[PDB]
Structures are given as C-alpha cells and as structure tokens.
C-alpha cells in the first residue's frame, strides 16, 4: 500500500503543464500538455538552440563580432515597443557572447534579430532552421513564424513541445545551455539580471531555462532543476497569476523530486546477457544496449527493480552485426513490466573463418 502508492498531483494554476525526467523522457505529470498555445518568449529557447547548433558546428565563435544592422535597431523598429531589449543600434560591433546572453538572460528581441541575420542571413531563413529543428525533434504541436516570440498569428507550441525543446537544449547543445544559469551580464556599461527568478531559490538547484509573458500567452515558464542523479524539466503555460509565476513551477519540481528517482541500470557496451551463436568466429554473443538506459520509478523502489529479457529468434546465427537487435530487455516492478529497451549485439560476430 505504501510501496505501491500512486502520489496525488498538486493543483497547478495554469492552462497547461508537463513535468518530465530529462534522462528517461518519462512524463511524471501532465495536463493539457498538447494544447496549442502562444509561446511568448519561450520561442527564444528555439532561437538559442539554432544558435547553439551553429556554434557546435563551428560556424562562429563567442568572441566573433556581429555588426548590428537596421532590423536589430531597438528604437528604430516600433514592433519592439514594450518588449525586452538590449538597445542595439546600427553599426555597433557586439561579440556573439554578449548577444547570446542578451537572448538567454534578458530575452532581448533585438539581439534575436541580430543573431538571426548573423547565423542565417535573414530572419526568414533562420525561422526555417527553427522549423527544421521542430521536425527533427518530432514536435507535433509547434510552429514558428518569428525569431523572438512576438505573438505572430500562426506560431504556437505546447507544454510538452516546450519541455522537449528544453531537453534538446541540455542534451544537444550543453555549452549553450550552461549560459542559462548565469545570474547577470554587463552590456554597454549596464548590468543585466537573468529574468529567471528561480535561479535565486535556495531550496532548489534550478539552472534554466526561460520565462515568458505576452498578453495572449499568460505566464510561461520552462524550468530545469537537479537533485543528485536526477534532472527534471517543467513547462507551465498560461499561468494565471503574477504570484504563481515561479511558485506553480516550483510545486511541480519539488513534487517530482519527492516522489520519483532516476535509475541508470545499464550503460552502452556493457554485457547484460550472453547467448550461444551458430556459424560464428566465436561461440557466444555479448548482449546489451546501444543507448544508456535511464528509468524513472517511485522514489525508494530502486532495490525492487528486476530485469529480464526475451529473444526474437529461437537461435542466433552469424553473421551478427554490432547493435543488431535480437530481443527486448524487460524492467519490472512488483512482477509487472514497466519499461522495455531493445537488446542488441555488443561485439560483432562474423561467420567463422578457419
Ligand atoms: C517574452 O515573452 C517577453 N518579451 C517581450 O519582448 C514581449 C513582446 C514581444 C514583442 C516583440 C517581439 C517579441 C516579443 Cl515576445 N510582447 O510582450 C512582451 C512582454 C518577455 N517576458 C516578460 C515576462 O516574463 O514577464 C518580460 C520580462 C516583461 S519581457
């Protein structure tokens, strides 16, 4: 009863949310997680991903100077009215390091344009990259039209999709993600605070990601926090009150850490099982996984976890290719399969040569 309890989810004062484990991908809690909503400033998480991907690929460096053009002139474009801005002016020569901090820390809309032109030649081309990454990540309820998150009529995303963009940032572009925890940066003599207030919350280790508000979106937050071996991502969209701003997301994260833990029962290349092989240069196949196994389970239940396996075929016949799928690993709690992973050949077995 204690051992098999399903914990109640706290009431969250928002249109939609999701809570996921970063490593396992497991959804711990959700409500209206696939409803299409105005992303507001959360759009900039994708802007930052594209930039992070360009930098990973070596297209430019943080020390590189970007010359500011007219479309990134903050007080030259009334579209930027009442919005977060670096106050760039044409002709300024600003290091990439400073513009990506303008975007990540400050949500500078002008810095988004500046980087979009620098990275991709035009804002349309850059939005095209954002949308190509939407497809590659397999996001089903997301579409961008703008580089900064301006309520543009046909852009949308979802709590699920925004958490997934969060996970992609941490996983694919860790050097870009490491910027999000920085509490401040200085530009043009002026000190600028990271807008993510949760970074200052002593009770959690929040290191990301992005807050947002436009008048169609409500209050929006994608947060990520760690506690030991465990990283959670929350996405809360259409938060109703100014006071629930960080509080509602904190509720989900603290609940997640209290009731769940992440286990890593198996790593790539390590033997889980061995099976006889026929016609081979060796007599036995070493079997395991081609991707690290992470599971999210109820907290405490780690020592109750059982693993077993099944095989696709009665017999293993060489040649066996490395990472050839030959079965399925079952992870179980209380005698019930909770998670499955493909069982694969770890070391190639070509046909015998004598
Ligand atoms: C993101 O949602 C908010 N940033 C804005 O700039 C903003 C816009 C906007 C206008 C032009 C281009 C893009 C955008 Cl998103 N329209 O309204 C706003 C407020 C930033 N997030 C909020 C917040 O979290 O409360 C601010 C710090 C006020 S600015």
3-state secondary structure the chain: CCCCCCCCCCCCCEEEEEEEECCCCCEEEEECCCCCECCHHHHHHHHHHHHHHHHHCCCCCCCCEEECCHHHCHHHCHHHCCCCCCCCCCCCEEEHHHHHHHHHCCCCHHHHHHHHHHHHCCHHHHHHHHHHHHHHCCCCCCECCCCCCCCCCCCEECHHHHHHHHHHHHHHCHHHHHHHHCCEEEECCEEEECCCHHHHCCCCEEEEEEEEEECCCEEEEEEEEEECCEEEEEEEEEECCCCCCCHHHHHHHHHHHHHEEEEEEECCCCCCEEEECECECCCEEEEECCCCEEEEEECCHHHHCEEEEEECCCCCECCECCCCEEEEEEEEECCEEEEEEEEEECCCECECCC
Residues 98 and 156 in one domain: yes
Residues 157, 56: one domain? yes
Residue 200, C-beta contacts closer than 8 angstroms, at least 6 positions apart: 183
Last residue within a domain, chosen from 259, 292, 309: 259
The CATH number of whichever domain residue 293 belongs to comes to: 2.60.410.10
Ligand 1 binding pocket includes 152 (Cβ within 6 Å) = no
Q: For atom 29 of ligand 1, which residue has the closest CA?
A: 84
Pull the structure tokens for residue 192: 């600028």
Specify burial of residue 343 (Cβ count, 10 A radius: 0-12, 13-18, 19+): buried
C-alpha 256/C-alpha 231 separation (Å) is 10
> 44 an active-site residue?
yes
CA distance 262 to 295: 6
183 and 48 fall within a common domain: yes
Task: Note whether 337 and 218 are same-domain residues.
Answer: no
- Domain span at residue 19 reads 1-259
Identify whether residues 96 and 245 lie together within a single domain: yes
Ligand 1 neighbour 245 (Cβ under 6 A): no
- Which residues lie below 8 Å from residue 272, measured CB to CB, with a gap of 6+? 266, 287, 288, 289, 307, 309, 329, 343
Q: How far is the CA of 151 from the centre of ligand 1 (A)?
A: 9
Residues 119 and 165 grouped into a single domain? yes
With the CA atoms of 119, 120, 121 and 126 taken in that order, what torsion angle do they form, in degrees rounded to the nearest 10? -120
Distance 22 CA to ligand 1 centre (A): 27
CATH number at residue 98: 3.40.710.10
Catalytic residue among 44, 84, 157, 251: 44
Residue pair 94/120 in contact by the 8 Å Cβ criterion: no
Is 180 in the same domain as 318?
no
The residue to mutate among 45, 149, 217, having the most atoms of ligand 1 within 8 angstroms of its beta carbon, is 149
- Partnered with residue 320 across adjacent β-strands are 349
Does 216 qualify as catalytic in the annotation? no
Which among 16, 24, 84, 107 is annotated as catalytic?
A: 107
Sheet holding 14-21, edge to edge: 27-31, 14-21, 230-239, 218-227, 205-214
Phi, psi of 259 (to 5 degrees): -100, -15
C-alpha dihedral, 20 to 25 to 31 to 34, nearest 10°: 130
- Boundary (domain end) residue, out of 232, 259, 286: 259
Closest residue to atom 17 of ligand 1, CA basis: 214
Q: How far apart are CA 21 and CA 295, in angstroms?
A: 9
Residue 210, annotated as binding a ligand: yes
Q: Which residues pair with 280 in a beta bridge?
A: 351
- 41 catalytic? Reply is yes
Check if 52 has its Cβ closer than 6 Å to any atom of ligand 1. Answer: no
Single out the catalytic residue among 41, 157, 158, 286: 41
Measured from the CB, is residue 195 less than 6 Å from ligand 1? yes
Bridge partners, residue 186, by sequence: 191
Calpha distance 70→79 (Å, rounded) = 13
* Contact indicator for 116, 123 with CB cutoff of 8 Å: yes
Q: Are 45 and 237 in contact (CB under 8 A)?
A: no
Best mutation site among 37, 38, 40 for ligand 1, i.e. most ligand atoms within 8 A of its Cβ? 40
**What's the token pair of residue 338?**
């909770």
Q: How far is CA 225 from the centre of its chain?
A: 12
Q: How far apart are CA 212 and CA 38, in angstroms?
A: 10
Residue matched to tokens 């996970």: 167
The answer to whether 119 and 54 have CB atoms below 8 angstroms apart is yes
Tell me if 104 CB under 6 Å of ligand 1. Answer: no
User: Cα angle vertex 168, ends 292, 29, to 5°?
Assistant: 80
**Same domain? 187 vs 298:** no
Q: Of 259, 286, 321, which residue sits at a domain end?
A: 259
Same domain, 238 and 335: no
- Taking residue 318's Cβ as centre, other Cβ atoms within 10 Å add up to 18
Give the Cβ contact number of residue 70 at 10 Å: 12
Could you tell me the two tokens for 317?
Answer: 């016949």
- Domain identity same for 75 and 222: yes
Q: Distances from the Cα of 15 to the Cαs of 30, 140, 218, 228, in angstroms?
A: 11, 19, 9, 30
Q: Give the distance (Å) from ligand 1 centre to CA of residue 55.
A: 26
For residues 225 and 271, membership in a common domain is answered with no
Region of residue 214 (phi > 0: left; psi between -120 and 50: alpha; otherwise: beta): beta
**Domain identity same for 64 and 205:** yes
Q: Are 2 and 126 in contact (CB under 8 A)?
A: no
For the chain, how many structural domains are there in total? 2
CB 225 within 8 A of CB 232: yes
What resolution in Å is listed for this PDB structure?
A: 1.9
Biggest CA–CA distance in the chain, Å, is 78
Counting from 1 in the atom list of ligand 1, the atom nearest the Cα of 84 is 6
Residue nearest to atom 5 of ligand 1 (CA): 83
Give the angle subtended at the CA of 228 by the CAs of 226 and 230, to the nearest 5°. Answer: 55
């Amino acid at each position: 009863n204690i051992k098999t309890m399903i914990p109640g989810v706290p009431q969250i004062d928002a249109e939609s949310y999701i809570l996921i484990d970063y490593n396992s991908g497991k959804v711990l809690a959700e409500q209206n997680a696939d409803v299409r909503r105005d992303p507001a400033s959360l759009t900039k998480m994708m802007t930052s991903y594209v930039i992070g991907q360009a930098m990973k690929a070596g297209k430019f460096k943080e020390t590189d100077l970007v010359t500011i053009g007219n479309d990134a002139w903050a007080t030259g474009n009334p579209v930027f009215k009442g919005s977060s801005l670096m106050f760039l002016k044409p002709g300024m020569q600003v290091p990439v390091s400073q513009l990506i901090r303008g975007i990540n820390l400050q949500s500078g809309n002008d810095a988004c344009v500046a980087m979009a032109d620098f990275a991709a030649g035009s804002q349309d081309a850059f939005v095209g990259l954002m949308n190509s990454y939407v497809n590659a990540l397999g996001l089903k309820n997301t579409h961008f039209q703008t580089v900064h998150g301006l309520d543009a009529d046909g852009q949308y995303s979802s709590a699920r999709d925004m958490a997934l963009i969060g996970q992609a940032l941490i996983r694919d572009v860790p050097n870009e993600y490491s910027i999000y925890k920085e509490k401040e940066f200085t530009f043009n003599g002026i000190r600028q605070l990271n807008r993510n207030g949760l970074l200052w919350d002593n009770s959690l280790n929040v290191d990301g990601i992005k807050t947002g508000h436009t008048d169609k979106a409500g209050y929006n937050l994608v947060a990520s926090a760690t506690e030991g071996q465990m990283r959670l991502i929350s996405a809360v969209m259409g938060g109703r009150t100014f006071k629930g701003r960080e509080a509602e997301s904190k509720k989900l994260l603290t609940w997640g850490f209290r009731f769940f833990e992440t286990v890593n029962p198996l790593k790539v290349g390590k033997e889980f099982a061995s099976e006889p092989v026929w016609f081979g240069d060796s007599d036995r196949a070493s079997l395991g996984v081609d991707k690290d196994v992470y599971l999210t389970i109820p907290r405490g239940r780690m020592k109750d976890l059982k693993a077993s396996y099944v095989l696709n075929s009665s017999e293993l016949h060489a040649p066996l290719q490395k990472n050839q799928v030959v079965g399925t690993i079952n992870f179980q709690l209380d005698g019930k399969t909770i998670e499955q992973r493909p069982l694969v050949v770890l070391q190639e077995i070509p046909e015998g040569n004598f």
